Amino acid sequence: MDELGIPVYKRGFPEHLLRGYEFIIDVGTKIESVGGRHDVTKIPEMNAYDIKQESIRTALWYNPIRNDGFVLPRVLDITLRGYDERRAVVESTRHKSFHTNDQWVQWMMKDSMDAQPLKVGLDDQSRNVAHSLHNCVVKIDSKKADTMSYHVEPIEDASKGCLHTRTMMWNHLVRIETFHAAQEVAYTLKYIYGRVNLFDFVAEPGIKIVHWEYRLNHSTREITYAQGNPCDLYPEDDDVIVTKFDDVAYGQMINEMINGGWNQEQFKMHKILKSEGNVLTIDFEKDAKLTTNEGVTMPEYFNKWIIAPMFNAKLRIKHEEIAQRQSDDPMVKRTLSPITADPIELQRLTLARFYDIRPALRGQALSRQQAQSTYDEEISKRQDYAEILKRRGIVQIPKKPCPTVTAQYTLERYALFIISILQQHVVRDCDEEAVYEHPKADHELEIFGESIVDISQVIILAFDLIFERRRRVRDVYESRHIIARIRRMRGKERLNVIAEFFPTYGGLLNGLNSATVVQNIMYLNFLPLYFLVGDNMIYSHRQWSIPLLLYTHEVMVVPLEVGSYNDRCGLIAYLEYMVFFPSKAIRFSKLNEAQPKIAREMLKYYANTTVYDGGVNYNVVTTKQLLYETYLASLCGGISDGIVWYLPITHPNKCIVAIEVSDERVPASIRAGRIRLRFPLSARHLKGVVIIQIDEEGEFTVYSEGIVSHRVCKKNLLKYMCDIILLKFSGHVFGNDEMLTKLLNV
Ligand SMILES: [Zn+2]
């Protein structure tokens, strides 16, 4: 009750002796610094928050097995907001009783990229759960322990334009494939030939390969709204193969569909293209035959361009000299005439049989300091960099951007691009006599004012703006639960929680039994946007294809595989077809006979598709937050260790006090502000914040906010001696109850 003290001792203070206290700082066993950073490399050795030592993209996919299980940093905030928001419901006697939304708190608990896996140094002669940390071992009495977690933070470095609260967002980018560097697929002799991935080809410049060139058939037509950027199937270019839709197969598909409903399993994009020579079937290891005579016969397209208008692609194979030799950091383009740098271009290369991507990071997972991958500075030279960064509130401009700068760039330009693409499928009411460059992003676009941080946010926004005309971005948790809640339902009820959040939109696909013109059917294409993307999901089975309408002159319903002929997920799978939309005349057409029934089938298919559902490895995928935290610390930084744990207070009001032990490097107050950040929606309960800051020399120094009040003083049991940080909470009883376990078990 009222004031705890926390003794902080260096060996050899016995601590047989200190067990009376509830929290202890042993300053003690330090980890030596390797000047001037203190070295993350010892982490797998100390205990720790396990991160095996490894080249960093194979840290991403890592498992982890040296922990004792996972704490979530926000579990306290999760259930404080859980408890704050209970429904009242009147009882049989007229008393209220308060029901937890205990299913939003389940969903909120899973679906949490925070989670970190720690190894504690738990001993069996005392009840104490030790956490090693670079300057001290902190030992919490187990009753207080459940909330404790690291609050590691890499040093913001102003020349790089750092903003490290965006770390999570970075990690989220990588998970949804928008931080990768690319490279076209390549072959060599190992039938003869065989694919060889270019990131690690270990070959000197001046040696030949065969490699797919792969450009957009043409990004950015100069289109006018009476036209549409319809994807005409008949380019008039000499001596290039074009891929054609096969009418007899496509007709059979549509009849199977109008009768038996849409078939995700058995419908296929490759199946409705004429074989000579369709992009989805052709292969190179299986097409350059041995043969018998006279030999070395390359497949009949081996220098020709192959325009593929449905995919807006234009890939051709070739012999090509490589450059730049091998190196460990994509993007260093691995050949003369390579494939594109800019990340929103890669979002457009639907066919992904033709290139490999790995996330653009470089080197050891635990390094105290290493040169950054060049990808950031390479995104930086992009035109439209300065202009899109201004929306981010970055007035100019890092010369060697930290990843989070280019994370911010990437996700903001991405959002602009997805909206400028999608705005075309709604009706527009403006002069069609105004040419404009079509799939250009807007920059001047008006949206405000919760800053973009998640594609789920961009999706909620695609509907909120295109349909609701609510030009406003929702909080990341509100949107992730919006999508989660749409997916959670099937059948008609899924259509009810759409049109609960987007009433005009669902209110206009609820209505499609009317649907006279093609414009009315045209709204179905937005549907894939729920099921197609998120940092933590994998497709139930990639190679299922979901229905879509591409707009050539006549509105064909293609199946697009999710995705994308390369087990990548997602929003590549889908986004690029959407860059085609009908000419205004095709956009009024007044349907025909089969179109209403195809649309009824499409919406009925999405109404209960579960294509997003295939089970993720939660253990692998959510756990990586501390990996990016310390890796990024190596890129700028270095790191600053620190655990925080929350001490519940129970009178007069029920309220949390964060207590925080940490490295001396970043100043206490800013660290306290960041502490308040782990309460995205419950900050109001966090009523005061102690921050003990142990020096590298073992020279600690407290700091505190409201409700708490520290005062340091020596304790001298005979020869043995050490400081006890007293912590008065004047006016607040806080002791004898299961407050913490009540607080969590909400
Ligand atoms: Zn940085």
Side-chain angles (χ1 to χ4, degrees):
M1 276 151 194
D2 195 42
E3 43 148 322
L4 64 61
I6 34 225
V8 27
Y9 61 107
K10 63 210 52 190
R11 325 167 313 200
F13 192 104
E15 96 137 334
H16 227 142
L17 255 321
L18 242 32
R19 264 190 244 162
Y21 295 85
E22 208 167 39
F23 176 63
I24 266 165
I25 297 139
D26 168 34
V27 293
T29 25
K30 348 178 310 188
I31 226 18
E32 311 261 293
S33 141
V34 179
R37 278 111 196 284
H38 50 23
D39 68 332
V40 292
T41 35
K42 251 59 172 71
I43 272 166
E45 202 171 341
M46 72 164 66
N47 72 214
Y49 39 99
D50 87 317
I51 295 172
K52 183 177 42 195
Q53 169 65 303
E54 190 151 32
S55 298
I56 209 243
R57 319 90 156 185
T58 13
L60 304 185
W61 90 327
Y62 159 64
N63 190 251
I65 13 187
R66 209 202 102 83
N67 59 86
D68 304 309
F70 319 76
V71 63
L72 313 100
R74 293 173 304 94
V75 58
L76 201 27
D77 158 281
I78 300 306
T79 67
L80 277 188
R81 169 59 89 73
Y83 165 92
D84 265 325
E85 268 196 314
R86 289 150 130 201
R87 228 48 107 275
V89 24
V90 152
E91 283 297 345
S92 175
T93 54
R94 326 232 302 108
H95 300 57
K96 317 287 198 63
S97 81
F98 302 100
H99 291 351
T100 322
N101 185 6
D102 52 2
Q103 96 149 336
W104 158 100
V105 99
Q106 299 309 358
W107 166 86
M108 195 78 254
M109 219 79 77
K110 96 183 313 166
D111 174 85
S112 191
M113 312 304 277
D114 287 315
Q116 46 214 234
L118 337 169
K119 157 154 249 59
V120 306
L122 134 81
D123 159 47
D124 71 340
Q125 194 188 330
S126 140
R127 39 154 159 91
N128 253 344
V129 201
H131 297 259
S132 229
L133 194 179
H134 282 62
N135 282 348
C136 44
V137 174
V138 151
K139 322 201 185 180
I140 262 271
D141 163 273
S142 77
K143 293 234 274 195
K144 297 339 232 291
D146 340 350
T147 57
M148 172 127 76
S149 42
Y150 285 76
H151 164 245
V152 154
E153 57 184 7
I155 312 310
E156 45 175 359
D157 163 32
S159 324
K160 295 178 79 85
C162 295
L163 161 61
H164 288 181
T165 44
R166 296 283 93 104
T167 309
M168 231 296 312
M169 168 173 81
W170 179 22
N171 153 21
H172 162 74
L173 271 180
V174 157
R175 289 286 302 133
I176 61 162
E177 329 271 275
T178 352
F179 204 87
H180 300 68
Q183 226 117 218
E184 57 281 54
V185 304
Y187 308 86
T188 26
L189 318 156
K190 17 192 195 334
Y191 301 70
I192 13 180
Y193 297 104
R195 178 147 148 214
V196 52
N197 177 306
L198 271 221
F199 295 109
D200 39 18
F201 179 45
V202 62
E204 220 54 43
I207 88 131
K208 284 159 97 303
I209 60 177
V210 306
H211 84 130
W212 282 100
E213 197 143 314
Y214 179 1
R215 292 198 269 91
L216 284 168
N217 169 39
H218 30 45
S219 53
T220 84
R221 324 271 309 291
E222 197 74 4
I223 218 49
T224 102
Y225 184 88
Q227 280 79 16
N229 191 28
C231 59
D232 69 316
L233 299 182
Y234 315 95
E236 197 194 354
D237 299 41
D238 235 27
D239 60 76
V240 303
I241 315 177
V242 299
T243 21
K244 311 194 180 178
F245 284 109
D246 175 273
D247 267 320
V248 196
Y250 163 65
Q252 286 180 3
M253 147 181 282
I254 251 203
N255 296 351
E256 274 187 16
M257 184 204 160
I258 241 182
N259 283 340
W262 176 269
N263 193 1
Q264 51 169 31
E265 184 84 356
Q266 214 259 16
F267 289 155
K268 269 317 192 332
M269 185 55 155
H270 78 82
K271 253 150 76 95
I272 65 175
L273 310 190
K274 296 169 68 172
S275 31
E276 185 174 15
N278 81 340
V279 220
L280 266 70
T281 318
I282 79 185
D283 213 332
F284 200 52
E285 76 163 324
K286 303 238 310 317
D287 267 24
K289 235 196 109 47
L290 304 121
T291 141
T292 63
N293 45 282
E294 209 182 339
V296 280
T297 169
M298 288 132 194
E300 197 212 36
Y301 50 71
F302 172 74
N303 166 51
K304 290 182 274 187
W305 266 116
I306 326 180
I307 294 187
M310 333 120 287
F311 304 83
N312 185 27
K314 201 184 192 304
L315 21 67
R316 78 170 155 84
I317 1 196
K318 197 208 328 190
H319 287 285
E320 184 74 75
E321 192 44 82
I322 95 195
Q324 301 294 344
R325 81 162 74 103
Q326 199 245 3
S327 183
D328 170 69
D329 79 311
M331 38 180 47
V332 47
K333 269 8 151 313
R334 196 73 163 77
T335 152
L336 285 175
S337 161
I339 80 160
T340 49
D342 61 307
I344 45 105
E345 190 92 318
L346 270 8
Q347 287 321 88
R348 283 175 85 184
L349 296 186
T350 324
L351 309 161
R353 320 209 288 110
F354 297 88
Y355 66 91
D356 279 334
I357 50 118
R358 63 208 290 171
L361 305 328
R362 175 236 265 269
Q364 294 329 288
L366 307 181
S367 153
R368 75 184 63 96
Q369 151 102 32
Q370 50 187 340
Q372 184 186 41
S373 124
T374 100
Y375 169 88
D376 305 357
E377 177 246 331
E378 266 272 14
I379 251 52
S380 167
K381 292 166 318 148
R382 182 139 325 284
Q383 179 264 339
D384 183 28
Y385 192 61
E387 174 173 17
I388 250 134
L389 240 30
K390 177 163 50 197
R391 303 169 112 285
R392 270 330 182 108
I394 313 303
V395 55
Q396 297 160 24
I397 241 199
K399 196 178 303 305
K400 316 283 295 173
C402 113
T404 54
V405 188
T406 65
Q408 259 160 292
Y409 166 82
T410 265
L411 186 54
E412 240 273 319
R413 171 189 180 86
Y414 198 17
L416 292 190
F417 177 73
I418 285 150
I419 281 145
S420 165
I421 283 181
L422 276 177
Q423 243 156 352
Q424 317 307 320
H425 296 245
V426 188
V427 255
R428 227 131 131 290
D429 285 330
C430 75
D431 55 332
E432 319 103 25
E433 292 287 348
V435 332
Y436 59 106
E437 180 179 284
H438 171 245
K440 156 213 280 309
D442 204 277
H443 332 138
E444 300 316 311
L445 192 70
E446 204 55 23
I447 69 188
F448 46 70
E450 241 305 324
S451 54
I452 311 275
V453 130
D454 221 272
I455 17 66
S456 63
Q457 224 158 322
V458 198
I459 282 166
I460 251 51
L461 206 232
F463 293 88
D464 242 25
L465 188 158
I466 260 66
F467 290 109
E468 301 311 303
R469 298 210 177 79
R470 310 201 277 259
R471 197 175 301 274
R472 153 171 271 78
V473 175
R474 298 171 124 133
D475 294 338
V476 64
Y477 301 116
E478 179 178 335
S479 38
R480 299 190 54 159
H481 198 220
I482 286 171
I483 271 119
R485 218 160 87 65
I486 290 194
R487 287 172 187 171
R488 203 209 282 141
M489 252 50 111
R490 292 308 129 78
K492 196 251 187 169
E493 334 160 328
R494 183 199 294 283
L495 259 29
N496 281 344
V497 331
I498 322 196
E500 196 266 7
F501 299 113
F502 318 106
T504 110
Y505 165 66
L508 119 192
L509 67 56
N510 251 333
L512 78 31
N513 288 333
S514 298
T516 324
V517 305
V518 114
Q519 177 54 85
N520 303 133
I521 263 174
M522 205 169 318
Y523 304 116
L524 267 347
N525 268 5
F526 291 70
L527 279 189
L529 266 175
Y530 305 115
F531 316 78
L532 249 264
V533 71
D535 28 15
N536 64 344
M537 45 149 290
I538 37 170
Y539 292 138
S540 217
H541 171 252
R542 26 94 181 145
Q543 286 164 304
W544 291 359
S545 358
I546 62 181
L548 197 109
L549 340 150
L550 51 47
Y551 310 92
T552 52
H553 49 288
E554 96 264 339
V555 185
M556 183 94 263
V557 185
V558 299
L560 55 89
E561 150 158 335
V562 283
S564 207
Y565 319 112
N566 205 30
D567 191 3
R568 51 196 287 107
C569 143
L571 224 70
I572 329 267
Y574 150 95
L575 181 152
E576 229 290 318
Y577 307 81
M578 217 43 63
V579 107
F580 306 120
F581 66 92
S583 270
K584 195 178 204 179
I586 323 157
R587 189 202 287 262
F588 298 119
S589 74
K590 205 189 52 60
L591 290 198
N592 58 45
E593 211 255 350
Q595 260 139 27
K597 298 192 285 166
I598 267 66
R600 167 159 49 67
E601 264 329 291
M602 250 196 77
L603 154 108
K604 129 90 86 48
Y605 160 82
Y606 282 114
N608 23 252
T609 176
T610 75
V611 80
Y612 54 94
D613 202 48
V616 269
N617 192 339
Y618 278 118
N619 259 43
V620 153
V621 135
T622 79
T623 259
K624 257 64 240 173
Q625 184 55 12
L626 278 183
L627 186 113
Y628 293 78
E629 289 280 6
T630 96
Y631 167 74
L632 172 76
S634 107
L635 301 178
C636 347
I639 203 192
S640 204
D641 233 52
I643 26 198
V644 59
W645 113 71
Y646 314 97
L647 174 239
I649 277 173
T650 137
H651 296 120
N653 296 318
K654 208 189 305 294
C655 80
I656 285 314
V657 170
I659 308 211
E660 230 276 29
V661 176
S662 79
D663 182 30
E664 189 56 4
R665 254 156 268 259
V666 27
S669 78
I670 109 101
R671 168 156 230 134
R674 255 69 171 294
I675 274 314
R676 202 162 260 94
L677 230 38
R678 285 145 96 86
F679 291 76
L681 22 77
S682 180
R684 86 121 167 297
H685 290 280
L686 169 50
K687 275 284 181 45
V689 176
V690 182
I691 301 217
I692 300 87
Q693 275 196 309
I694 281 101
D695 211 337
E696 179 167 307
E697 194 35 50
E699 221 25 75
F700 83 101
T701 136
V702 214
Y703 153 87
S704 53
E705 287 206 13
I707 273 55
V708 213
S709 182
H710 72 258
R711 173 254 278 237
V712 159
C713 46
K714 342 286 274 83
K715 154 204 197 44
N716 275 278
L717 202 263
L718 263 177
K719 139 214 267 187
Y720 310 119
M721 42 159 304
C722 77
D723 323 50
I724 322 284
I725 301 185
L726 253 342
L727 284 187
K728 254 265 171 180
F729 303 106
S730 263
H732 300 261
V733 169
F734 82 89
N736 291 339
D737 42 14
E738 311 304 330
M739 181 40 61
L740 197 260
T741 123
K742 228 135 49 170
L743 207 40
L744 261 18
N745 252 18
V746 97

